[PDB]
DNA sequence: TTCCCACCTTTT
DNA sequence: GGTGGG
């Protein structure tokens, strides 16, 4: 075995025999840039500095000479070969081998050898095995060969992915298994960092692994540096190796050899070793003897001979220059074309982009990727050269080309079907030689063909990658024989479960990065403004690979809108920098004379003096440019247009043409409904055949803008068609906004794949004009919808997303139809720059779409009292039709529309069309109206005046200025329609005014004025509501009223009580019927909805609600830790639920009510605070949200009977929003109906009021409020005729065998639901035991009273409140003393560090058996809460103050806060499974409040308040603690009552004192002064005695308390 | 013979 | 920051 040195030390030595075997082969692979070239000449350079023969063989295509020449390459002796195919290559491989006079060959990419076969056949020609074969069979020709030549084969690879697999690594290598095997030597280089000149990027820190080795031992690694234009680091390497191995000295930076300095610092030291090669020698033969493992130990004039005649030999089989001396091939050198850019040019190094060879340019959307790439052509196009734009992302504004200075005319432009269409269409223009440069417009839009013909949500597993790595392939060669440059435009992806590095990748595998000699990453940095106006984008280009110059160098330059790239703009600045041009403040000088004043003018000076320009711009690139550079026609034309036919002839009648004549591309808009917006969107509006997005808050108003375009469009005669995946369209409301409901095709599809593939056919069909569809968001994968709530399935509705776009694009643009895309927001999350707002579905939507439209509600349109619109505004956000940026404010009047006279009036008065004498408006002096009102009242009146002026505003306001046939429609229309119904079912698509199913029907939410407010009569079937509001506010009562409602009418209904904390007692109280009510108490959240679809699908169960999202805690979260970080789980959750279960309830008519709570957002000045748990989805999703508060109490006097209450509605899709209903909840009684039948009826004159006196038709029929109610109670026929009527003269949008089936529909669910969810997962709340209230004594007699039921609730949550030694322990421990009174097990957490258990024994406490915990950690706390609750083992626990929970990270912005309403959601299940009440002991700090946040508040079904009020005096001694609890909340009686009794220090609750007073207030205990008799007998004097006396007579005061018990419980 | 792709807040 | 499947 004999070597060649590497050119690297450190890879000699991993190497183990000191660099690579002769005669051997040799394999290199790695990812582009790596430094797989370098290498290999780096080892030729090496072998050539020794007398050896080496060929290049450059099937890569991509060789520079000159750089070669640079790495110390000899150019003029170095055999080089181009070949056609991979054959051919290995031919001349072979051919050199067996020659003996070539010593070592390298291969250029076995990637690039493409087999004859390959070349020959089209891109997308089943090729199966082809480049494996030949490689295998390569190998057992050329191994023979090479080892009797003793000739070294290098080959080098690239990498590609293997997909599909699940261990080791996914990566491979191209062209089978043949040469791992063969390979006596493989090496995998890599590129691991940047070598940094403080600013600038010099070279690549690079690592080769020596993977294979049958030479010495293999696995050792090398690290060096990759200087570009320089080499292999070698003498960097010299100095750490030496130094390593010491035999240079290291002292600080000081590096010494033999006593001698050498240098300071690693840069020296190196150059030193440059400067002494003999002594550079003598450490380097050191190093080698000490680190080498395995020990390397008339004759060439012969050689010459042999090798001429193998020259010969080759030369004569593969044609005219096949093989040849690098120095001399003139095809080889590099030439350039500008980029349109100068800074670019000199960041590109050479001074521009290079012909023959292959660019990718990526970014994302808007960017500026087309407009550059329309700058090279402008560019080339200026210099005769003839360019092709291939539009697959079918988006070209012919007419912006224009502007940006494209010869239109001579632009060759084609918008083919499929990606393999695309792609042949270059190799044919390629192979012609008649085109200089090919653009085509994203790589992204190359739809392999298979993915065309098939359907949406098809898996076609790297069938892109594929296409892309064959094209490669074919290109390359023929790029470079006809010296043609192509630049790839492609798009940004995100790559997903990636924490190091970037997550960004580029479409279509990973062929084009290692093919592309430059790749661009363009970015939008900024704006360039025009103090109001976006008049540019500021711009910025990474050089990201660089093969024709050092690469990681950048341009920031500014794109100014309908102008182009401002390179005036950087010839300034340059021209500045570089001193060329003077500046002194804002003048700018040239020689002397002075140009402008201020970077404007001097550009302008530039513009209008080219020659000069011409002078600054060649200086500055002499200046600044690394890589500087230095009949026939008619031929070319004749061999174009044979091409050109050749294509059309293959492809079809226009497959290929001139720009500036197809008129296919020609830019046609329609209205949107907002005059205003139409001027934003600058070409008057939407544009045909493209994609566009609108995107927005909640009820901002993306429907409604939808539903007016199809308006507008319909009034001209064009088809539309809406899909309704949001399943919430009121086709009523459709009407009133003007659109044809006969005539609108409208589907409401099960699946996301469904959805778009109804898109598709209705875009294949020609039939229709505008399609949208409502909520990409409620877009559901196929596999999400038969999966369960739960399930992760990463990136799939992305990946939908991204398919659709690539099968839509073409067919909506040849079919001239505009798609329109409503999308949600989600908020992202870990985001501290920027803003956090984002878009459902991926990233495809942004790139494809062609207008993106940002809507939002900005305020209210008020009619003194009411809400009669909105105020809107939408910004546009993306414009590929012209500039962007530009925004529209207008009103939407609620059920009228976009008010768009309104928009003309400000418009018309604003372009000084119409006058505006103070409020009287004029039109050409006749006056037309006082007041906004009424002058839009009368345009409405004058259409023709209307059209008029709108035309004029239209001249004045718009850049960019627009302006048996239908037989053959209706044919392909019901063709498409038949279709889509045969593969979807029944009624999957229909017209709107047909669709019975669509129609609302409503429920009573059983209060008459919220049925009012609601505008509809009641809640909507079918559809998702959601009520939120404080604590207490009555939002369970609520719904339990629209339960008992429903159930009144024979109706099923469900509850979820997720907050565990129904009192089916009450229930009843409000008329629930409890033993039909289904009813559920989940564990997880999962479960929760999971049964909700269950029950949805069953179509038994006519009303579900879900008591308190809050509590819908996420399995995960369960079943970790308190403290534990969930992000955006329960949003997640939530989001997810939404898509499932909007579709399932729709078509089971099933309404869905959710509970929800409201927390406090933190870091907000502006607006309200307040926010609803759970994400974002719900907000969405709701057809109705309702605002509900206690805004007063209902008295008795003294007792509080009641709460006063109100209900806003916030969300309305049903009817007209912002309406509010007050109203009474009367506890134990519900909602107080008959009451506001009163009160609505008196308002509606239907009955009298004289005073206190109300009449009814003459007849009185009672004194008082309270009386008339009665009345309408006793008449309850009267009762129905005047609500009838009432809600005829107040509800603004009125309504309109078998059971036996449902009954086997709910048992099969049931049956169902108990398999999957275990025993008793679900039940009917009557027959539920476990729902049952048990209560435990507090201490205090008058505290039990006060609570109503007796005592504090089992398995409930309790939170006691108050200010310092008020007794909050004291009664804690009282309760925990009667409990073990009564063999209950007993838990104290005392956090707040200060339980005197000697004292807690005073009051009764048994010590002995009070489980007891003093925690660190708050998280600890109630950790030990959670496993004790979980224990079913202790019956009572209490946390000593929650104020003194603090949180893990505290104890090394509202922390407390979010662990305690984690706390809450965990707890509230346990506990109550368990039986197991838990008291929370809260500190104070009306301005009070209770730490912890605001989960506690919601979630304790007893708040308790307490209080000391005064001092029990022994005359000179303070012997106790006057003391007042208040029942502040009451989950499980009337709340609001109140408890005084006395704490004597030592003892407790004056238990004997409280005996007393109620004995005497309930007339048991006779008091006569200061007399206290009982039964006669007198048993003391004055308060003090009487107590005492009871205390000796237990027995007596047992039979007083039971009476007063009685009495009062 | 060779990838594709995000999703979501949480709390004074 | 945890989540894979065609
Ligand atoms: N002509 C050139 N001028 C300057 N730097 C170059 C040139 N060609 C290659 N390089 C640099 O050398 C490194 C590896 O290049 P190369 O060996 O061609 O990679 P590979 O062949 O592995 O794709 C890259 O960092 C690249 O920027
Ligand atoms: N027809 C047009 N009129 C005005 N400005 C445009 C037009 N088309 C594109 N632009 C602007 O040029 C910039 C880049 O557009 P483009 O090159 O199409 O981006 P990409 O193709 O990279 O998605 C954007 O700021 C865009 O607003
Ligand atoms: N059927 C209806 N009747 C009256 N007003 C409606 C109706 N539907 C929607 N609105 C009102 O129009 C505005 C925007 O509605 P919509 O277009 O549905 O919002 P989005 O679709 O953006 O969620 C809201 O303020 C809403 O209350
Ligand atoms: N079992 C009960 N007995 C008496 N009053 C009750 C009962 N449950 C609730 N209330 C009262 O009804 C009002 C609203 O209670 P609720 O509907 O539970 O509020 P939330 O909105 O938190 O679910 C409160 O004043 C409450 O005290
Ligand atoms: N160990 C004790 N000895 C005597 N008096 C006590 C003791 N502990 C508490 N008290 C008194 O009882 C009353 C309330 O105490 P406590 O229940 O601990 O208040 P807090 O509400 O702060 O927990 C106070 O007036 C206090 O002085
Ligand atoms: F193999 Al290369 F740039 F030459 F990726
Ligand atoms: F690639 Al684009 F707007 F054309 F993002
Ligand atoms: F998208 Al919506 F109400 F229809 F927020
Ligand atoms: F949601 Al509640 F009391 F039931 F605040
Ligand atoms: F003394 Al305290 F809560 F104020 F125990
Ligand atoms: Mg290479
Ligand atoms: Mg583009
Ligand atoms: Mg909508
Ligand atoms: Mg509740
Ligand atoms: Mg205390």
């Given at each position: 075995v004999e070597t060649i040195s590497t050119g690297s030390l450190s890879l000699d030595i991993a190497l183990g025999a000191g660099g690579l075997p002769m005669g051997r082969i040799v394999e290199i692979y790695g990812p582009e840039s790596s430094g797989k070239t370098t290498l290999t000449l780096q080892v030729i350079a090496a072998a050539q500095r020794e007398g050896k023969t080496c060929a290049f063989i450059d099937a890569e295509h991509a060789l520079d000479p000159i750089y070669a020449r640079k790495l110390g390459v000899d150019i003029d002796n170095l055999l080089c070969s181009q070949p056609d195919t991979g054959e051919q290559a290995l031919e001349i491989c072979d051919a050199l081998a067996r020659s003996g006079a070539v010593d070592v060959i390298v291969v250029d990419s076995v990637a690039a050898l493409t087999p004859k076969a390959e070349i020959e056949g089209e891109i997308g020609d089943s090729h199966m095995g082809l480049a494996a074969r030949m490689m295998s069979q390569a190998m057992r020709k050329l191994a023979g060969n090479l080892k009797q030549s003793n000739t070294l084969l290098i080959f080098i690879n690239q990498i590609r992915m293997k997909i599909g697999v699940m261990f080791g690594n996914p990566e491979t290598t191209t062209g089978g298994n043949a040469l791992k095997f063969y390979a006596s030597v493989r090496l995998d280089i890599r590129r691991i960092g940047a070598v940094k000149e403080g600013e600038n990027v010099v070279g690549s820190e690079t690592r080769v692994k020596v993977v294979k080795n049958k030479i010495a031992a293999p696995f050792k690694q090398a690290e060096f540096q990759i200087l570009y234009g320089e080499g292999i680091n070698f003498y960097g390497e010299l100095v750490d190796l030496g130094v390593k191995e010491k035999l240079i000295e290291k002292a600080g930076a000081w590096y010494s050899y033999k006593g001698e300095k050498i240098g300071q610092g690693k840069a020296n030291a190196t150059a030193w070793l440059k400067d002494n090669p003999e002594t550079a020698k003598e450490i380097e033969k050191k190093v080698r003897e000490l680190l080498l493992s395995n020990p390397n130990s008339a004759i060439d004039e012969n050689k010459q001979k042999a090798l001429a005649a193998a020259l010969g030999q080759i030369e004569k089989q593969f044609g005219k220059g096949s093989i040849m001396r690098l120095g001399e091939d003139r095809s080889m050198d590099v030439e350039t074309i500008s980029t349109g850019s100068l800074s670019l040019d000199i960041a590109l190094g050479a001074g521009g982009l290079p012909m023959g060879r292959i660019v990718e340019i990526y970014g994302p959307e808007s960017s500026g990727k087309t407009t550059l790439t329309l700058q090279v052509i402008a560019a080339a196009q200026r210099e005769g050269k003839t360019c092709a734009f291939i539009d697959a992302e079918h988006a070209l504004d012919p007419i912006y080309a224009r502007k940006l200075g494209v010869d239109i005319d001579n632009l060759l432009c084609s918008q083919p079907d499929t990606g393999e269409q695309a792609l042949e269409i270059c190799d044919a223009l390629a192979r012609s030689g008649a085109v200089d440069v090919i653009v085509v417009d994203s790589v992204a839009a190359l739809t392999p063909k298979a993915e065309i013909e098939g359907e949406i949500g098809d898996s076609h597993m790297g069938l892109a990658a594929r296409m892309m790595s064959q094209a490669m392939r074919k290109l390359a060669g023929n790029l470079k024989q006809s010296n043609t440059l192509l630049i790839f435009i492609n798009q940004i992806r995100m790559k997903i479960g990636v924490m190091f590095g970037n997550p960004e990748t580029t479409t279509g595998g990973n062929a084009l990065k290692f093919y592309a000699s430059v790749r661009l990453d363009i970015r939008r940095i900024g704006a360039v403004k025009e103090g109001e106006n976006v008049v540019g984008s500021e711009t910025r280009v990474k050089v990201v690979k660089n093969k024709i110059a050092a690469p990681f160098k950048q341009a920031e330059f500014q794109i100014l809108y309908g102008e182009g790239i401002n390179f005036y703009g950087e010839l300034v600045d340059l021209g500045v920098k570089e001193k060329l041009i003077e500046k002194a403040g804002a003048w700018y000088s040239y020689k002397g004379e002075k140009i402008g004043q201020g970077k404007a003018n001097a550009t302008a000076w530039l513009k209008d003096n080219p020659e000069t320009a011409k002078e600054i711009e060649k200086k500055v690139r002499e200046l600044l440019l690394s890589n500087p550079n230095s009949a026939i026609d008619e031929n070319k034309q004749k061999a174009l247009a044979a091409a050109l036919g050749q294509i059309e002839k293959q492809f079809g009648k226009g497959s290929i043409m001139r720009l500036g004549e197809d008129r296919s591309m020609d830019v046609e808009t329609i209205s949107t409904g907002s005059l205003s917006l139409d001027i934003a969107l600058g070409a008057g509006g939407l544009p045909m055949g493209r994609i566009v997005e609108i995107y927005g808050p909640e009820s901002s108003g993306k429907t409604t803008l939808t539903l007016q375009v199809i308006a507008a469009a319909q009034r001209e005669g064009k088809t539309c068609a809406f899909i309704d995946a949001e399943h919430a369209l009121d086709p009523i409301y459709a009407r009133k906004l003007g659109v044809d409901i006969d005539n609108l095709l409208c589907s409401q599809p099960d699946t996301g794949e469904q959805a778009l593939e109804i898109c598709d056919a209705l875009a294949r069909s020609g039939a229709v004009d505008v399609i949208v569809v409502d909520s990409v968001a409620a877009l559901t994968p196929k596999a999400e919808i038969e999966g369960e709530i739960g399930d992760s399935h990463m990136g799939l509705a992305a990946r939908m997303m991204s398919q659709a776009m690539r099968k839509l694009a073409g067919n909506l643009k040849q079919s001239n139809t505009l798609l329109i895309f409503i999308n949600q927001i989600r908020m992202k999350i870990g985001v501290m720059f920027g803003n956090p707002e984002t878009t459902t579905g991926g990233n495809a939507l942004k790139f494809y779409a062609s207008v993106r439209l940002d809507i939002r509600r900005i305020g209210a349109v008020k009619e003194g009292e009411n809400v009669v619109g909105s105020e809107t505004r939408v910004k546009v956000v993306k414009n590929k039709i012209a500039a962007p940026f530009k925004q529209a404010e207008f009103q939407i009047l609620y059920g009228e529309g976009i008010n768009f006279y309104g928009?003309?009036?400000?418009?018309?008065?604003?372009?000084?069309?119409?006058?505006?004498?103070?409020?009287?408006?004029?039109?050409?002096?006749?006056?037309?109206?006082?007041?906004?009102?009424?002058?839009?009242?009368?345009?409405?009146?004058?259409?023709?005046?209307?059209?008029?002026?709108?035309?004029?505003?239209?001249?004045?306001?718009?850049?960019?200025?627009?302006?048996?046939?239908?037989?053959?429609?209706?044919?392909?229309?019901?063709?498409?329609?038949?279709?889509?119904?045969?593969?979807?079912?029944?009624?999957?698509?229909?017209?709107?005014?047909?669709?019975?199913?669509?129609?609302?029907?409503?429920?009573?939410?059983?209060?008459?004025?919220?049925?009012?407010?609601?505008?509809?009569?009641?809640?909507?079937?079918?559809?998702?509501?959601?009520?939120?509001?404080?604590?207490?506010?009555?939002?369970?009562?609520?719904?339990?009223?629209?339960?008992?409602?429903?159930?009144?009418?024979?109706?099923?209904?469900?509850?979820?009580?997720?907050?565990?904390?129904?009192?089916?007692?009450?229930?009843?109280?409000?008329?629930?019927?409890?033993?039909?009510?289904?009813?559920?108490?989940?564990?997880?959240?999962?479960?929760?909805?999971?049964?909700?679809?269950?029950?949805?699908?069953?179509?038994?169960?006519?009303?579900?609600?879900?008591?308190?999202?809050?509590?819908?805690?996420?399995?995960?979260?369960?079943?970790?830790?308190?403290?534990?970080?969930?992000?955006?789980?329960?949003?997640?959750?939530?989001?997810?639920?939404?898509?499932?279960?909007?579709?399932?309830?729709?078509?089971?008519?099933?309404?869905?009510?959710?509970?929800?709570?409201?927390?406090?957002?933190?870091?907000?000045?502006?607006?309200?605070?307040?926010?609803?748990?759970?994400?974002?989805?719900?907000?969405?999703?709701?057809?109705?949200?309702?605002?509900?508060?206690?805004?007063?109490?209902?008295?008795?006097?003294?007792?509080?009977?009641?709460?006063?209450?109100?209900?806003?509605?916030?969300?309305?899709?049903?009817?007209?929003?912002?309406?509010?209903?007050?109203?009474?909840?009367?506890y134990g009684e519900g909602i107080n109906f008959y009451g506001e039948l009163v009160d609505l009826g008196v308002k509606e004159k239907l009955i009298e009021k004289a005073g206190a006196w109300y009449s009814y038709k003459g007849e009185k029929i009672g004194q008082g409020k309270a009386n008339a109610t009665a009345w309408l109670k006793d008449n309850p026929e009267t009762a129905k005729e005047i609500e009838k009527k009432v809600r005829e003269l107040l509800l603004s949008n009125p309504n309109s065998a078998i059971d036996e089936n449902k009954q086997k529909a709910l048992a099969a669910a049931l049956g169902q639901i108990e398999k999957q969810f275990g025993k008793g997962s679900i039940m009917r709340l009557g027959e539920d035991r476990s729902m049952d209230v048990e209560t435990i004594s507090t201490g205090s007699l008058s505290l039990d009273i006060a609570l109503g039921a007796g005592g504090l609730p089992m398995g409930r949550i309790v939170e006691i409140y108050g200010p310092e030694s008020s007794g909050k322990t004291t009664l804690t421990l009282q309760v925990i003393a009667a409990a073990q009174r009564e063999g209950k097990t007993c838990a104290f957490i005392d956090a707040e560090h200060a339980l005197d258990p000697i004292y807690a024994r005073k009051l009764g406490v048994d010590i002995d058996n009070l489980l007891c915990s003093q925690p660190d950690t708050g998280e600890q706390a109630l950790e030990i809460c959670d496993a004790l609750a979980r224990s079913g083992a202790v019956d009572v626990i209490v946390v000593d103050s929650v104020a003194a929970l603090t949180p893990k990270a505290e104890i090394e912005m509202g922390l407390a806060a979010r662990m305690m309403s984690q706390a809450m959601r965990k707890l509230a299940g346990n506990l109550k499974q368990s039986n197991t009440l838990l008291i929370f002991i809260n500190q104070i700090r009306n301005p009070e409040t209770t730490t912890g946040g605001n989960a506690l508040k919601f979630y304790a079904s007893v708040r308790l308040d307490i209080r000391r009020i005064g001092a029990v005096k022994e005359g000179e001694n303070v012997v106790g603690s006057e003391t007042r609890v208040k029942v502040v909340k009451n989950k499980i009686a009337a709340p609001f009552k109140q408890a005084e009794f006395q704490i004597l220090y030592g003892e407790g609750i004056n238990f004997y004192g409280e005996l007393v007073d109620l004995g005497v207030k309930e007339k048991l205990i006779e008091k006569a002064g200061a007399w206290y008799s009982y039964k006669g007998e007198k048993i003391g004097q004055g308060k003090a005695n009487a107590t005492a006396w009871l205390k000796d007579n237990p027995e007596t005061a047992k039979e007083i308390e039971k009476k007063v018990r009685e009495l009062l419980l």
């Open positions: 928009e003309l009036v400000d418009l018309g008065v604003k372009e000084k069309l119409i006058e505006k004498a103070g409020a009287w408006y004029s039109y050409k002096g006749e006056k037309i109206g006082q007041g906004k009102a009424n002058a839009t009242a009368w345009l409405k009146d004058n259409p023709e005046t209307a059209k008029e002026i709108e035309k004029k505003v239209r001249e004045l306001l718009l850049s960019n200025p627009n302006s048996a046939i239908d037989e053959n429609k209706q044919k392909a229309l019901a063709a498409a329609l038949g279709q889509i119904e045969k593969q979807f079912g029944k009624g999957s698509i229909m017209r709107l005014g047909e669709d019975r199913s669509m129609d609302v029907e409503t429920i009573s939410t059983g209060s008459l004025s919220l049925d009012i407010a609601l505008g509809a009569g009641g809640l909507p079937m079918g559809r998702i509501v959601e009520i939120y509001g404080p604590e207490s506010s009555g939002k369970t009562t609520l719904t339990l009223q629209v339960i008992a409602a429903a159930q009144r009418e024979g109706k099923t209904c469900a509850f979820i009580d997720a907050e565990h904390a129904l009192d089916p007692i009450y229930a009843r109280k409000l008329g629930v019927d409890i033993d039909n009510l289904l009813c559920s108490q989940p564990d997880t959240g999962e479960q929760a909805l999971e049964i909700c679809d269950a029950l949805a699908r069953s179509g038994a169960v006519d009303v579900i609600v879900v008591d308190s999202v809050a509590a819908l805690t996420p399995k995960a979260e369960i079943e970790g830790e308190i403290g534990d970080s969930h992000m955006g789980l329960a949003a997640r959750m939530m989001s997810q639920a939404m898509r499932k279960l909007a579709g399932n309830l729709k078509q089971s008519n099933t309404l869905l009510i959710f509970i929800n709570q409201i927390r406090m957002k933190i870091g907000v000045m502006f607006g309200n605070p307040e926010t609803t748990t759970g994400g974002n989805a719900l907000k969405f999703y709701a057809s109705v949200r309702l605002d509900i508060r206690r805004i007063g109490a209902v008295k008795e006097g003294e007792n509080v009977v009641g709460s006063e209450t109100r209900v806003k509605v916030v969300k309305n899709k049903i009817a007209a929003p912002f309406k509010q209903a007050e109203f009474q909840i009367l």
